[PDB]
Design a protein around this ligand. Structure first.
Ligand code: SF4
Lengths: 886, 186, 428, 433
């Protein structure tokens, strides 16, 4: 606070004749407040000289005080903290096609006013209050009988409003009244807070600041700055988002981190989402659909709050913050950079230092597979080899120059001291566990140890991140090479005691134990842990996840049976009929059963044979064959409308969003579809099509579930045209044929005996090469995932991502440089004299082909005709080589 | 290690004539039977010859170092017979070479040479226990020829000019050395 | 490659982001991810793609997307909501810019379009223009443009070519003759079906297509008077050429057996100078391939050639259409996207006169003070007279005032060729 | 780069017929050249390693490696394409074998041995001009110091080239050139009395020095490429090839005649296990079926005889078989679907498949079996205890395929494909008959 030029800072490169550099030009006031006062995260503060009368109507808090100097505030040693008022928020939005604006329809407020982190949270806390607001998505009135019927079946309170304005006014008022301390919800930070702040801005509610704790009457004038403005607006109430980067960091098992998937993975309960869309006209007069929607919202709110209690998000972030000393929010809604920044700031500042100015083995694995943690790899290296800014001698002129590790005579630094301090605290916590009897204190020890290990593991983000305050490429390269060496020696140790490295990186490696009993796999994993700790005294890896059966395709695209369920493969249930889902699920159940997998496989096989027979005889209920699909646009404006069946059925009926249920009957695949209720009617004489559902709907999924001569086996043949009589015929070199004959005077068609002069042959060879190259530059791409298999020429900016929404296949240029190059190589071999003489050429015709040659040439005839036709063959070969050499 | 390095063989050839005159006569360390057993017998390669020489010297005590040197060959010839005798003669000659090297080869202080940062006493510095001057060494130098500080003070009491001591020849040798060093530097 | 192709299709978007930010003086904070929900209006640059990976041939303003680069939106494609824009024109492959909002989370509405700025034209100093005045000797500069194919689909007669060469040698007498393929087109019916007959007028018959060109075009191209500079710019359909993907490496003059005295073989595409003129020459039929999407009466009432000439200028690339169109296989545009650097306006200079042969009717136009000439084909398939181009440019004059001075410490002068050049489309 | 600049630059790079691969190759190759050159040199390395593991003499190794030198990677030739092959293939292998320390150690020893052979295979004049590119001594100077040089270098020659005979050592010395240079550059050799010195000059046993400097320089460059590889992972066309060549380091025949001793006596361990399991369980699961079916297809079992063999082995109901297994058993023979004549499985592809559990017999036993069961098998195969210990040694390292070759040769008198095992066995059996 200065009377003049408070907003103008001092550049570091200020011109002066007595000094030449300035530090701290751009310090942050909270940064200096915390560094000077030695604050480390949330702790009890003793504040003296607090002015209880200077502050008038400045916040949403009941208690308002002020201080005149920062030295009045000092930290205490108290380890207990008061109970937190958490509020659970969930939002259902409605996209307005007119302005492309997401609009707010319903709010579900679940509050938990006595959430205490000092004691283990008991599972399934019931909230102290439940609220659910809703405004009409289409009209200004609701369907009749909403209030009483929602009272009848929905839990908590439901509040009905005529419009979104009184909606958000009451929401803000309830937030001010509740005065919660932590806001909990799923994907709040990057989608829901943003949309909520925007729709608030639009409606001009007086009480927008209630979402935070600082009372403001007007918005910022400038309202990427949207994030800074929103985060400042919500200041005071931490945003506890479970799908944010940290919330994802505490659930490595998930793949979508959608609410249902997170709920299943962390709470071992099942929830089937209802795809909601308030654009649908049914939500304006059908009360039951609206109330099912609100129930979905309330269930999402409870699910989110419960999972955030279960993964221990708040406690772990609190302990990570007390460890790195930054703000709690910077831990909750950020990345490792904030914590790795603040702990280094504190560590160097308290020591009189000047800180800078601001591959898989895919398939089905039957043996037990363990997920073993290398999170503490880089901290282990940094501590062991004393790698620090003050120990390693390096060239700062060239940052890529790899430095050598300090000799043991050098003394330890600041950062490895922090790492060793963290390791020691984890070890003392574990020693306390080994004696502790009360489960509450034992789970407290769990949380403290886990936060210590997470900080140690995230320590590498201080220096490995490029834009980081303490970036140091030489040290990063040294630590990284040492970690690569240690990962290798782990692989070698695993081989030396008879395991495989199934998949592995600097974070985590899964190991083939080779045993089929839980105790045996656990013992093998513990033995390997002891082995690695013996070879590396400080590297203490653990077992994180146990896999009895593993269907592996990547680090994060797999199906397996865990030990303490399917993730990543059940999203597409609409396209597949009831029969296909029954088949897939029964196949999985038998395969994953405890039977001998030659009898379980024969049981699958009998099931498949019986289902094939049942479909062919059509003794299966017509209900089991139905396929549902929602219409995004109108059936008359659908591009390629002749290829998806719903357009055919809907136009035969003749809007968008109407659900069409259909059965492929027994002409085009799209055309054969008939109305499901039509196919039930036997007098219509309609039966399902065995071939379609047996190939595309049942064979395709289980195909994924149950997962010189050689070179050219996929190459294509050269089709010539005879100049005179227009007879087209493949060319296979100096070989037998019913269409062409190589005479002593040149290539001769057999239909009209007219010879090919070299021009009429090389022109056509080169026309075929040009056709192939035009095809290869057309750029056809495909999707490797057999259930998507689309054909495309678009290339998304990330080249290898399939464009099917969320589809996990790997796109590849259909006419690869491999197929194309090989095609040109076969084109060459068609004109190689040595190959033609040796009769090594690929065959054009199969023995069942109707044009198989009746007369087979002799070896002597081939050799003589090749020697007589060497010039022709050489010119033909050079025509191709003029592209092969390009 | 065998065969001997050019440098090592040259040092051995330089040292061989002095070996007798110094060790076997002037010092005569092995005339003491216990000293002989402690220093000579270890350096042999064969246990049977070692034990035989031990017994022969215990039977004939206080035989001179030259006498024991000859007895080594006499008893070795007595013991090792047959087509393998030449190997034993070769090994005994190698042992004798190893021993003369052990007894007369330079024994350098390893530490002072290794590093550029080592400190070594400057020339002409006084020795605190003897008072001798650390004077340069010529071919005729001996420990008794090094002047003492009390003697230099006595000489200086008669004539007050440093050029009139026995220290001055050493300073003149130093001056010749520095002149040569300067011209080779140029 | 595909990683390289994705790299280049990212660099298109990012460099055009940089150019837009420099031109409109916007800070990169404005540039943001358009496919992910937001609360405020944001700025965005990306390519045009079908809102499907497999699409129906015909597109409309309700089935478009705006693909995002790697750091703008990590490769995600966003559908287009274009209901609030009444005047627009896009096309597939066109790196564009938007200001809008994606609160719908699924649809990116554009409140306003940023038209890409047209590149700065070439400039030259007084000394160079005076040298060009001395070179021209007062008389004007004369350049003839021809574009193939030069013989009919049913015969091998170049009588029309010999007529044209006698014409340019004896009456027109142009300084530089620039001529384009296809020379021996690979899609020719008689050449694709293998109906190439015995030639009585060649002592020794040809054996390949290269001998066909050497005996059919070299003897007749040698007859051009050495005073006439000739530039060869190939096409992808030249069977004489061994580079079947745009951009196309220059023909080899020695292999064509052409005289060094008056022939220069140049790469496709090519931007070069003749005296003071900046020429843009590229041989892939953009005027035919670029299939726009039109909204608005003002845009639809405008000349299609004017729109596509403006498109070729703004897209700082001679062939801005991606994916490369296909003739269904017989042929196609044949892009090699690993090298889509080379097909950009060399140095960022919008060429004074841009020559793009097209199968369409011969035209020559000035759009955005750039003379774009499209001469048509030398002979129609039937053998009737085709077309070729005549370019006549008044000699530069610093006193006549048609060259406009550019303010600055160093005096340099804009060429005003649209003021100085007359173009005549004379059927050959 | 114009091809003329490339030609001049390579002529400069190849002023000597052998190289230290100092400067990265410049120019363009087409991915077939990449792959074929890489596989050619890789097979030379694997042959060298197989010869070494058998402790054959360097003269024998030279004799064995001359022919596939003339076959895959020719040397002593003036061709520009052969030299392009050598450089580009070695640098591709540096890309391949930079990932792991065990691989880089293998590449370093292999390329070190290959370099030693190459240096011995050049004439003395070319050895001199290579050393120049370090002044070789004159013949008069060599003859003057002949005795001292021989005394210095005899022990090194005996212990490094295994020339136990004095006459062979003298012959080798007579042809061996020497290098005159300061001792200050050869201090490490000086301390061990490996180099003869006169008047401040060191007379280098040179090939060992050049080999060691090449090995150390190569190791440093390997570490450099391993540092820069995460900038190379971005291109799609290279990584699958690099992964494959990196991991690659790891009717008379009828439905009845397969089960006889005359035929199955030739099968390797994987096939023997697979048919043991089939005969005992009357069924093999997916992977076992696929690998054994394709192996039979390789050895010559026609689709009809294979269908009869599979039907008779499944002692279940033909209906079940005909619905479920005939389609697969025909498709593996290339009679269904896309009609791709599926290739028989090689040890790399077999080992890339997941490990066998309870009831699975697929994969390679040398990796899947505990050492006691292998010991019992090999004791049944009349292998002596030293032979079994050597097999278990090769198996312990992760060299399963080498141990397969060992059991083959030991039971008959580098195989990484079961059909190759069977066919070499058949070629020996017919020869014996
Ligand atoms: S090494 Fe190969 S052929 Fe031999 S048993 Fe193993 S998998 Fe079979």
């Amino acid at each position: 606070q200065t009377p003049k030029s408070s907003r103008d800072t001092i550049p570091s490169d200020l011109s002066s004749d007595t000094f030449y550099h300035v530090f701290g030009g751009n310090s942050n006031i909270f940064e200096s407040f915390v560094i000077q006062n030695r604050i480390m995260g949330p702790c009890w503060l003793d504040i003296k000289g607090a002015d209880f009368n200077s502050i008038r109507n400045a916040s949403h808090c009941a208690v308002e005080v002020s201080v005149d100097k920062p030295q009045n505030i000092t930290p205490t040693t108290t380890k207990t903290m008061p109970n937190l008022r958490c509020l659970s928020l969930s939002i259902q939005t409605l996209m307005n096609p007119k302005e492309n604006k997401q609009e707010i329809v319903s709010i579900t407020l679940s509050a938990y006013r006595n959430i205490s982190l000092d004691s283990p949270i008991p599972e399934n806390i019931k909230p102290d209050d439940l609220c659910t607001l809703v405004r009409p998505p289409q009209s200004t009135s609701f369907p009749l009988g909403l209030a009483a019927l929602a009272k009848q079946k929905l839990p908590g309170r439901v509040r009905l409003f005529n419009n979104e304005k009184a909606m958000l006014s009451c929401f803000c008022a309830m937030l001010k009244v509740e005065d919660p301390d932590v806001i909990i919800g799923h994907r709040l930070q990057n989608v829901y807070l943003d949309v909520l702040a925007h729709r608030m801005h639009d409606l001009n509610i007086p009480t927008f600041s209630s979402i935070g704790r600082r009372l403001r009457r007007t918005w910022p004038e400038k309202f990427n700055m949207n994030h800074f403005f929103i985060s400042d607006i919500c200041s005071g109430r931490l945003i506890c988002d479970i799908a944010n980067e940290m919330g994802q960091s505490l659930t490595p098992k998930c793949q979508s981190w959608d609410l249902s998937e997170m709920y299943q993975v962390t709470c071992e309960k099942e929830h089937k989402p209802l795809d909601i869309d308030y654009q649908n006209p049914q939500y304006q007069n059908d009360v039951n659909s609206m109330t099912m929607a609100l129930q979905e919202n309330i269930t999402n709110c409870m699910i989110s709050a419960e999972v955030s209690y279960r993964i221990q998000l708040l406690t772990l972030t609190k302990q990570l913050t007390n460890l790195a000393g930054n703000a709690w929010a910077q831990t909750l809604g950020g990345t490792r950079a904030g914590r790795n920044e603040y702990i280094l700031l504190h560590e160097f500042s308290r020591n009189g230092f000047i800180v800078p100015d601001k591959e898989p083995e895919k398939g089905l694995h039957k043996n037990y597979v363990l997920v073993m943690d290398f999170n503490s790899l880089y901290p282990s290296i940094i501590q062991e080899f004393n790698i620090c800014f003050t120990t390693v001698d390096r060239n700062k002129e060239d940052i890529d120059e790899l430095p050598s590790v300090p000799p043991s005579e050098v003394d330890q630094g600041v950062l490895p001291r922090l790492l060793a301090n963290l390791v020691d605290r984890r070890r003392e916590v574990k020693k306390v566990m080994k004696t502790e009897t009360d489960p509450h204190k034992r789970v407290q020890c769990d949380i403290r140890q886990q936060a210590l290990k997470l900080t140690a593991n995230s320590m590498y983000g201080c220096l490995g991140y490029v834009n980081s305050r303490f970036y140091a490429k030489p040290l990063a390269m040294l630590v990284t090479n040492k970690g690569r060496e240690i990962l290798m020696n782990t692989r070698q140790l695993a081989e030396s005691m008879n395991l495989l490295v199934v998949y592995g990186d600097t974070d985590s490696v899964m190991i083939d134990t080779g045993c089929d009993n839980y105790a045996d796999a656990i013992k093998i994993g513990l033995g390997f842990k002891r082995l690695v700790n013996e070879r590396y005294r400080l590297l203490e890896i653990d077992i994180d996840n146990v896999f009895k059966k593993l269907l592996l395709h990547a680090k994060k695209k797999y199906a397996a049976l865990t030990v303490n369920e399917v993730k990543g493969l059940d999203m597409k249930r609409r396209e597949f009929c009831p029969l296909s889902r029954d088949v897939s699920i029964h196949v999985l159940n038998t395969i994953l059963s405890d039977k001998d997998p030659e009898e379980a496989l024969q049981e699958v096989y009998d099931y498949l044979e019986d289902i094939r027979i049942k479909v062919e005889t059509n003794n299966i209920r017509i209900d089991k064959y139905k396929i549902n699909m929602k219409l995004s646009k109108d059936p008359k404006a659908y591009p390629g409308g002749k290829n998806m069946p719903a357009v055919q059925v809907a136009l035969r009926m003749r809007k968008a969003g109407s659900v069409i249920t259909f059965v492929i009957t027994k002409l085009s695949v799209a055309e054969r579809a008939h109305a499901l209720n039509e196919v039930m009617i036997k007098s219509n004489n309609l039966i399902p099509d065995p071939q379609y559902y047996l190939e595309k709907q049942i064979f395709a999924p289980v195909e994924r579930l149950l997962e010189d001569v050689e070179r050219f086996k996929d190459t294509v043949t050269l089709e010539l045209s005879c100049p005179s009589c227009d007879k087209r015929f493949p060319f296979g070199g100096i070989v037998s044929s019913n269409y062409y004959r190589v005479s002593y005077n040149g290539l001769q068609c057999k239909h009209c005996e007219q010879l090919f002069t070299p021009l009429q042959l090389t022109s056509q060879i080169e026309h075929s090469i040009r056709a192939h190259i035009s095809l290869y530059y057309a750029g056809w791409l495909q999707c490797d995932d057999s259930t998507c298999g689309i054909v495309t020429r678009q290339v998304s900016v990330f080249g290898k991502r399939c464009l099917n929404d969320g589809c996990t296949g790997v796109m590849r240029y259909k006419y690869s440089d491999k197929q194309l190059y090989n095609q040109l190589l076969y084109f060459d071999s068609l004109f190689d004299c040595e190959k033609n003489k040796k009769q090594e050429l690929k065959p054009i015709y199969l023995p069942d082909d109707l044009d198989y040659p009746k007369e087979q040439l002799t070896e002597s005839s081939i050799k003589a005709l090749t020697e007589q036709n060497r010039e022709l063959m050489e010119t033909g070969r050079s025509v191709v080589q003029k592209y092969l050499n390009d | 290690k065998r065969p001997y390095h050019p440098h090592l063989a040259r040092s051995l050839e330089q040292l061989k004539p002095f070996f007798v005159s110094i060790m076997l006569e002037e010092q005569n360390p092995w005339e003491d039977d216990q000293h002989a057993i402690q220093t000579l017998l270890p350096a042999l390669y064969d246990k049977q010859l070692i034990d035989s020489l031990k017994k022969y010297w215990l039977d004939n005590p206080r035989r001179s170092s030259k006498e024991k040197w000859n007895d080594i060959d006499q008893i070795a010839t007595s013991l090792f017979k047959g087509p393998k005798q030449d190997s034993h003669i070769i090994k005994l000659r190698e042992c004798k070479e190893d021993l003369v090297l052990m007894t007369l080869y330079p024994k350098l202080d390893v530490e002072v040479t290794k590093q550029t940062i080592h400190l070594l006493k400057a020339p002409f510095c006084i020795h605190p226990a003897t008072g001798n001057v650390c004077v340069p060494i010529d071919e005729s130098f001996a420990p008794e020829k090094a002047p003492k500080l009390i003697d230099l003070q006595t000489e200086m009491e008669k004539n007050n000019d440093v050029s009139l001591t026995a220290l001055q020849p050493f300073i003149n040798q130093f001056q010749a050395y520095v002149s040569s060093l300067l011209k080779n530097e140029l | 490659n595909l990683q390289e192709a994705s790299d280049v299709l990212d660099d298109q978007i990012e460099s055009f982001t940089k150019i837009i930010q420099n031109h409109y003086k916007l800070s990169p904070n404005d540039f943001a991810d358009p496919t992910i929900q937001s609360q405020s209006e944001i700025y965005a640059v990306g390519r045009i793609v079908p809102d499907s990976p497999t699409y129906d041939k015909f597109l409309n303003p309700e089935s478009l997307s705006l693909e995002t680069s790697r750091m703008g939106g990590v490769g995600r494609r966003v559908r287009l909501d274009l209901s609030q824009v009444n005047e627009l024109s896009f096309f597939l492959g066109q790196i564009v810019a938007f200001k809008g909002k994606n609160a719908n989370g699924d649809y990116f509405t554009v409140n306003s379009i940023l038209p890409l700025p047209y590149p700065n034209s070439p400039v030259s100093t007084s000394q160079e223009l005076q040298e060009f005045q001395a070179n021209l000797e007062g008389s004007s500069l004369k350049v003839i443009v021809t574009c193939g194919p030069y013989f009919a689909n049913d015969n091998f007669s170049l009588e029309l070519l010999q007529e044209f060469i006698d014409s340019i040698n004896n009456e027109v007498k142009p300084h530089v003759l620039i001529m384009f393929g296809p020379f021996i087109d690979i899609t020719h019916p008689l050449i694709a079906s293998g109906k190439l007959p015995n030639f009585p007028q060649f002592k020794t018959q040809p054996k390949t297509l290269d001998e066909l060109f050497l005996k059919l075009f070299t003897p007749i191209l040698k007859t051009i008077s050495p005073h006439i500079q000739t530039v060869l710019i190939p096409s992808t359909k030249d069977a004489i050429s061994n580079h079947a993907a745009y951009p196309q490496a220059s023909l080899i003059r020695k292999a064509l057996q052409l005289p060094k005295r008056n022939f220069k073989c140049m790469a496709n595409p090519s931007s070069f100078q003749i005296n003071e003129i900046y020429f843009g020459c590229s041989n892939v039929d953009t005027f035919k391939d670029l299939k726009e999407v039109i909204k608005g009466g003002t845009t639809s009432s405008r000349y299609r050639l004017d729109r596509v000439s403006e498109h070729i200028l703004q897209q700082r690339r001679y062939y801005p259409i991606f994916p490369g169109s296909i003739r269904t296989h017989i042929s196609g545009a044949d892009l090699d996207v690993s090298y889509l650097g080379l097909t950009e306006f060399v140095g960022g200079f919008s060429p004074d006169i841009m020559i793009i042969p097209s199968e369409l009717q011969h035209f020559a136009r000035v759009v955005q003070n750039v003379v774009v000439i499209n001469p048509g084909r030398f002979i129609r398939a039937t053998g009737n007279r085709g077309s070729y181009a005549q370019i006549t440019v008044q000699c530069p004059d610093l006193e006549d005032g048609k060259l406009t001075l550019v303010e600055g410490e160093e005096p340099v002068y804009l060429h005003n060729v649209w003021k100085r050049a007359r173009v005549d489309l004379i059927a050959s | 780069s114009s091809s003329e600049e490339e030609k001049k630059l390579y002529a400069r790079l190849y002023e000597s017929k052998l190289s230290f691969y100092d400067l990265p190759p410049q120019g363009e190759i087409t991915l077939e050249q990449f792959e074929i050159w890489a596989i050619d040199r890789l097979k030379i390395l694997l042959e060298i390693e197989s010869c070494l593991s058998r402790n054959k003499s360097i003269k024998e190794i030279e004799t064995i490696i001359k022919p596939q030198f003339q076959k895959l990677l020719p040397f002593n030739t003036e061709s520009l394409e052969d030299r392009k092959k050598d450089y580009y293939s070695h640098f591709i292998l540096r890309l391949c074998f930079c990932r792991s320390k065990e691989l880089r150690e293998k590449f370093v020893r292999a390329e070190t041995f290959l370099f030693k052979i190459r240096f011995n295979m050049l004439t003395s004049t070319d050895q001199t001009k290579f050393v120049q590119s370090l002044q070789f001594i004159s013949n008069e100077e060599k003859a003057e110091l002949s005795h001292q040089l021989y005394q210095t270098v005899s022990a090194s020659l005996q212990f490094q080239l295994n020339l136990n005979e004095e006459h062979q050592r003298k012959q080798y010395f007579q042809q061996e050139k020497f290098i005159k240079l300061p001792f200050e550059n050869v201090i490490e050799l000086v301390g061990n009395r490996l180099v003869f010195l006169k008047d401040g000059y060191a007379y280098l046993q040179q090939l060992n020095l050049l080999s060691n400097e090449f090995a150390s320089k190569l190791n440093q460059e390997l570490i450099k490429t391993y540092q820069y590889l995460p900038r190379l992972n971005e291109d799609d066309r290279l990584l699958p090839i690099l992964n494959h060549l990196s991991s690659g380091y790891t009717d008379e025949i009828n439905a009845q005649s397969v089960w006889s001793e005359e035929i199955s006596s030739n099968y390797p361990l994987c096939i023997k296990n697979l048919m043991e399991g089939l005969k005992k369980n009357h069924h093999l699961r997916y992977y076992g079926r696929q690998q054994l079916s394709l192996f039979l297809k390789g050895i010559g079992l026609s689709a009809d005889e294979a269908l009869k063999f599979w039907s008779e082995a499944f002692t279940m109901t033909m209906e079940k078989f005909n619905k479920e297994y005939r389609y697969s058993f025909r498709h593996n023979y290339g009679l269904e679907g896309n009609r791709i004549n599926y290739k028989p499985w090689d040890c790399h592809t077999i080992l890339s498949k997941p490990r066998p559990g309870r009831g699975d017999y697929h994969g390679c036993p040398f990796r899947d079996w505990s050492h006691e069961r292998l010991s019992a098998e090999l004791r049944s195969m009349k292998l002596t205890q030293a032979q079994i210990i050597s097999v278990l040694d090769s198996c312990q390292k992760g060299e399963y395929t080498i141990a397969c070759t060992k059991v083959f040769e030991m039971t008959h008198n580098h195989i990484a494909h079961p059909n190759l095992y069977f066919e070499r066995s058949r070629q020996l059996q017919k020869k014996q008959q």
